Design a protein around this ligand. Sequence first.
Ligand SMILES: NC(=O)C1=CN([C@@H]2O[C@H](COP(=O)(O)OP(=O)(O)OC[C@H]3O[C@@H](n4cnc5c(N)ncnc54)[C@H](O)[C@@H]3O)[C@@H](O)[C@H]2O)C=CC1
Ligand SMILES: NC(=O)C1=CN([C@@H]2O[C@H](COP(=O)(O)OP(=O)(O)OC[C@H]3O[C@@H](n4cnc5c(N)ncnc54)[C@H](O)[C@@H]3O)[C@@H](O)[C@H]2O)C=CC1
Ligand SMILES: NC(=O)C1=CN([C@@H]2O[C@H](COP(=O)(O)OP(=O)(O)OC[C@H]3O[C@@H](n4cnc5c(N)ncnc54)[C@H](O)[C@@H]3O)[C@@H](O)[C@H]2O)C=CC1
Ligand SMILES: NC(=O)C1=CN([C@@H]2O[C@H](COP(=O)(O)OP(=O)(O)OC[C@H]3O[C@@H](n4cnc5c(N)ncnc54)[C@H](O)[C@@H]3O)[C@@H](O)[C@H]2O)C=CC1
Ligand SMILES: O=C(O)C1(C(=O)O)CCC1
Ligand SMILES: O=C(O)C1(C(=O)O)CCC1
Ligand SMILES: O=C(O)C1(C(=O)O)CCC1
Ligand SMILES: O=C(O)C1(C(=O)O)CCC1
Lengths: 277, 277, 276, 281
Amino acid sequence: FQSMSVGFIGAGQLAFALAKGFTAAGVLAAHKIMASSPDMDLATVSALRKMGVKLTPHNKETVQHSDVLFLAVKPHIIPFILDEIGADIEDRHIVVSCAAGVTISSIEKKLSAFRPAPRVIRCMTNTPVVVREGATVYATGTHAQVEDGRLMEQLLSSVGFCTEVEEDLIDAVTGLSGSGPAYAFTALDALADGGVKMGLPRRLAVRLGAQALLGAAKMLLHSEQHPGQLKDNVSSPGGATIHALHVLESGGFRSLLINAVEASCIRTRELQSMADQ
Amino acid sequence: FQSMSVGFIGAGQLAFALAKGFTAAGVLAAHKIMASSPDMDLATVSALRKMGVKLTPHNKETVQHSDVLFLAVKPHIIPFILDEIGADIEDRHIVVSCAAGVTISSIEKKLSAFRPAPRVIRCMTNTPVVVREGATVYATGTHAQVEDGRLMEQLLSSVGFCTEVEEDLIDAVTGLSGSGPAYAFTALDALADGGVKMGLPRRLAVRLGAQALLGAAKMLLHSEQHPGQLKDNVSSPGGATIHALHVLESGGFRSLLINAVEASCIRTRELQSMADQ
Amino acid sequence: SMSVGFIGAGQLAFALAKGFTAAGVLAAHKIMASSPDMDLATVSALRKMGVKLTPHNKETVQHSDVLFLAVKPHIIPFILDEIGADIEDRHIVVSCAAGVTISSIEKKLSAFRPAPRVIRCMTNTPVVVREGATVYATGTHAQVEDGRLMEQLLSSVGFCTEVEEDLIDAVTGLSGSGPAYAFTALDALADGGVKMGLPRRLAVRLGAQALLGAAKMLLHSEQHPGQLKDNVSSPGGATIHALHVLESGGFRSLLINAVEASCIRTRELQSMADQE
Amino acid sequence: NLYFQSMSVGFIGAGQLAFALAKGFTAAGVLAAHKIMASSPDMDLATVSALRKMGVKLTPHNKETVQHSDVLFLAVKPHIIPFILDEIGADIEDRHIVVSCAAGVTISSIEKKLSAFRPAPRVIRCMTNTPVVVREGATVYATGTHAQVEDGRLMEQLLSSVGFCTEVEEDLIDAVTGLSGSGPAYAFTALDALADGGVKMGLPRRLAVRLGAQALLGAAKMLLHSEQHPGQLKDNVSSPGGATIHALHVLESGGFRSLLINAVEASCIRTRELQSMADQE
Ligand SMILES: NC(=O)C1=CN([C@@H]2O[C@H](COP(=O)(O)OP(=O)(O)OC[C@H]3O[C@@H](n4cnc5c(N)ncnc54)[C@H](O)[C@@H]3O)[C@@H](O)[C@H]2O)C=CC1
Ligand SMILES: NC(=O)C1=CN([C@@H]2O[C@H](COP(=O)(O)OP(=O)(O)OC[C@H]3O[C@@H](n4cnc5c(N)ncnc54)[C@H](O)[C@@H]3O)[C@@H](O)[C@H]2O)C=CC1
Ligand SMILES: NC(=O)C1=CN([C@@H]2O[C@H](COP(=O)(O)OP(=O)(O)OC[C@H]3O[C@@H](n4cnc5c(N)ncnc54)[C@H](O)[C@@H]3O)[C@@H](O)[C@H]2O)C=CC1
Ligand SMILES: NC(=O)C1=CN([C@@H]2O[C@H](COP(=O)(O)OP(=O)(O)OC[C@H]3O[C@@H](n4cnc5c(N)ncnc54)[C@H](O)[C@@H]3O)[C@@H](O)[C@H]2O)C=CC1
Ligand SMILES: O=C(O)C1(C(=O)O)CCC1
Ligand SMILES: O=C(O)C1(C(=O)O)CCC1
Ligand SMILES: O=C(O)C1(C(=O)O)CCC1
Ligand SMILES: O=C(O)C1(C(=O)O)CCC1
């Protein structure tokens, strides 16, 4: 909606990325966004203010400003925040938890102590929403209305891919697209190191490697063909590419990426088990 | 230019990718493009014809049609093609070799036997030009005019990144952005396998992993910050991402990507040494 | 009506003769095979089939219309010296030897008669069950009809296609050596079944049937082997867990290593032969 | 000349395995496609479209599949089996043979669910694989408490029309899952890598795929038709000092054999682990 007001409890990296994406998309004017942090001297806080976002140290003011309320504090702080603002949740509120691991059940339990039927949505997104190319999934809670999920999807589709999932997939999504950008940043640093080793200036190597990864990812998104088929399509017999693919295989490249998704997913599950405990 | 006619000797994967990119960009109408192959029954040939590209089995007709002439046959076939069409090169022609490894010197030597001052440009591009997100470098030959390089850059910038380089960087670029898409396809297959292992449907895992890589690459292209800093920015203390980055490091992930760039570059150098020999 | 000869009466002569006779393209007694050692198990098996056996390579040549060279590669030049004067204009000489070039064969035979009809092939032992994988390249003087005849004959015992000669050493590393990679894999898969509680006989049968069915699936599908693997592997399931442990050992790289090592050894041996 | 003229077959679940089995049965000529019904809550699946083109009858309602069928294949994911049994348990009649295809799921668990509605359900548990689609599957089955002797013979007749089929004790089926259930995926991985090897050494990709697949097919057929040990068949390929023995050495140096043992073990153990989780629920 044009009248919709959005708030962020937690004015850090993710609040900045989403606010920048939303305002770049034009789906929200910056003045319709309020964010709160217990430290008005942060870099993200100053960046948000320059964009035109309203800032406050008082989470209650963010709640009173907002229709859609994003929880963008660290997961261990979620229970603290819900106890602080629980009595301020109203019927109009859609509470959107961005925290890794934290279950809809745990959120609904804390909030229902103050007012029955909190409308809760859980999402897992990632930092590339800042360039409107995020990957977002969401699950709807017990009292979320049908239009609540559609509203969520409309908003988050403005900054990237967005689809509804069952909540029990979100920890695995965290391991894949939540942590995914960090795998790519690591890969791009190393690819640039390889370019530099073979004689390219570092700035050109970074640009070429990032462009290669962006273009390849877009090709796969626009293709019906299997990634293995696209692999087959880009390796000439006896050529340079198939020689490089062999050295990746000899190091177990594929297994390392499987290891990574698994380790991030398992850590996410472990953190939440400690929270519930 | 609007009057410019473009030809491809070799109507295979790369000719299709460039022709699709050029026509999607609107910089060339398909009817201004001619491509030739000794087998009019190929899949790429049929795809090119549906787009509106002119096709012929006779390389001489492609030469007579064209102002800009792309050589898109395999590197070992370049010398054969130059001997076949050498007497047909005219003053108006810009000969653009896309072949990995093949030097401007070797091309100019073959063509100068027929007519002095062939205008030659060497490029290294990649398949994502098909979605207008290629990575292209080019080097200008002895008799290339100044406007020849600018024309080249204008044309190839319509389908992705394009910059001029010294020719002695092109074999390293091949190892990085030429082979790069294949590294990404391999990585995306493995990331999807990881998503599937942790419980995601395969189609969703492929979509999320590709979107993660696309978004991360775009973030780096739009950032002044170091990829290591972006890595630092997306890993919370004690969190899922830093746990996954550790298992990548324990397998030497970075070294495998360095190995790959090196192996592709070295194979490219080795193939050309065999050609010159 | 075709008379076929094998110089060499070993494993490949036996496999091809068994395949050809099971296909009904040749009567066993229209095949003649020669070896200097008639006390071999392969010779005893050829004899039981009804194949004609002789110690004299000249007799095999004079009997034959199509002449297969089925001796070890380092024996090929000795054979060509021995019976080169006996090659007639009617002969089609089919070298099965790994690595040995058409050029090397034609150089020897052309010193006797000027236009020897030479075909080079690379096949494999599953011709014995009519599921071989065969490629061939035609020599300088081989007629178009010679290639067509070769393809009809070798298609009776499996897949067969013409290739450029410069691919044959790589084919050797893939489908020539391939059956041995498969036998090794099947032994290990059976060991895995036995470790998890299956009787050996059942584990061997199930593993071999799994491999046969999967290979036939791929041959009958237009889909990529990665997509076929996706149709097996359910999210969180048993197969994707097993695929991970294969990946962690670099399973794919070992098979690439194998094809490469077989191809390179083939090229290296021929390099030695050309030097000598 | 086999044909079950009085047999109606149903599939609960219209996914990969339902398609593969229906394609194999119809290609074998033992069943007409219109005597097969399959149900699924998602009628926009590619597998559903393929079944429709074969002539298979399709419905969203599992009760209709039950009422149509004599032999009822359960072809849903293992964690969905208990929900299915609660849904159509009251619809099971004396005539039904319930054939569970689900990995891990025990006859005991199926019989307990169905027995709450009607005593003596006839249950058979099987483990098959996708190559039934080309009639070269590998299938094992175990008969349940109330299955008649004719039930097992009938199912062996049906499943033998699409590949190898043999009766086993149920305690072997999780290990079979790790070997021939997951087996085709090991083969697809191996064939992709073998083709990568052929391409590295200069072969066109299409030829490399064809040759590698044919090599694996022929070798598997050789072993199935031979009385000799796989090591002896390997000895007939490898000449002294030759190309093959050089390649086998590099496989050995990487522990190739151990990886395939690891795979069978990992798939079997995961199958057991998943069922232990189901029993705890
Ligand atoms: N950055 C990422 O890559 C993604 C982050 N997330 C989730 O988003 C949440 C935050 O992520 P980041 O923004 O990276 O953390 P961050 O640490 O950059 O920002 C956290 C913010 O919370 C503020 N804060 C701390 N205590 C507070 C309180 N009592 N009341 C209000 N604000 C308070 C801090 O001052 C800081 O501004 C976490 O739950 C994380 O799981 C999920 C997807 C990806
Ligand atoms: N595909 C890629 O990833 C990239 C390819 N390249 C270069 O582009 C060139 C071709 O690449 P692909 O298109 O992938 O090869 P491709 O094999 O798909 O197409 C090659 C084309 O050449 C044709 N051809 C063969 N002999 C010919 C002749 N005598 N006259 C005319 N056409 C003939 C073939 O019929 C085929 O259509 C190579 O030199 C390669 O190094 C460079 C950058 C990346
Ligand atoms: N066994 C296989 O898997 C395949 C073999 N080949 C090729 O087939 C040829 C033979 O291979 P195998 O049959 O495996 O070897 P093998 O050693 O089983 O048979 C070789 C035969 O040549 C005979 N021989 C030795 N000196 C002779 C002479 N002077 N005149 C006539 N015969 C003589 C030996 O007695 C022996 O019977 C080799 O060149 C090999 O590269 C190619 C494809 C597959
Ligand atoms: N795919 C394989 O390689 C093999 C699979 N199996 C077993 O076969 C069963 C199915 O395997 P796939 O067909 O590969 O799964 P799949 O996921 O392709 O098909 C599953 C089907 O179940 C349907 N479904 C979900 N809930 C349902 C409900 N309440 N009522 C009816 N249908 C419902 C889905 O829509 C889908 O059509 C699993 O239990 C698996 O263990 C066993 C051997 C091999
Ligand atoms: O030569 C080629 O086309 C390349 C290959 O190795 O596939 C693409 C970059 C080198
Ligand atoms: O909790 C977080 O913010 C994540 C991290 O591990 O950095 C990003 C995805 C999990
Ligand atoms: O349950 C299944 O479908 C299997 C899997 O791993 O997905 C195939 C054999 C086990
Ligand atoms: O020469 C031979 O017989 C071969 C070997 O490795 O021995 C089989 C394919 C090469």
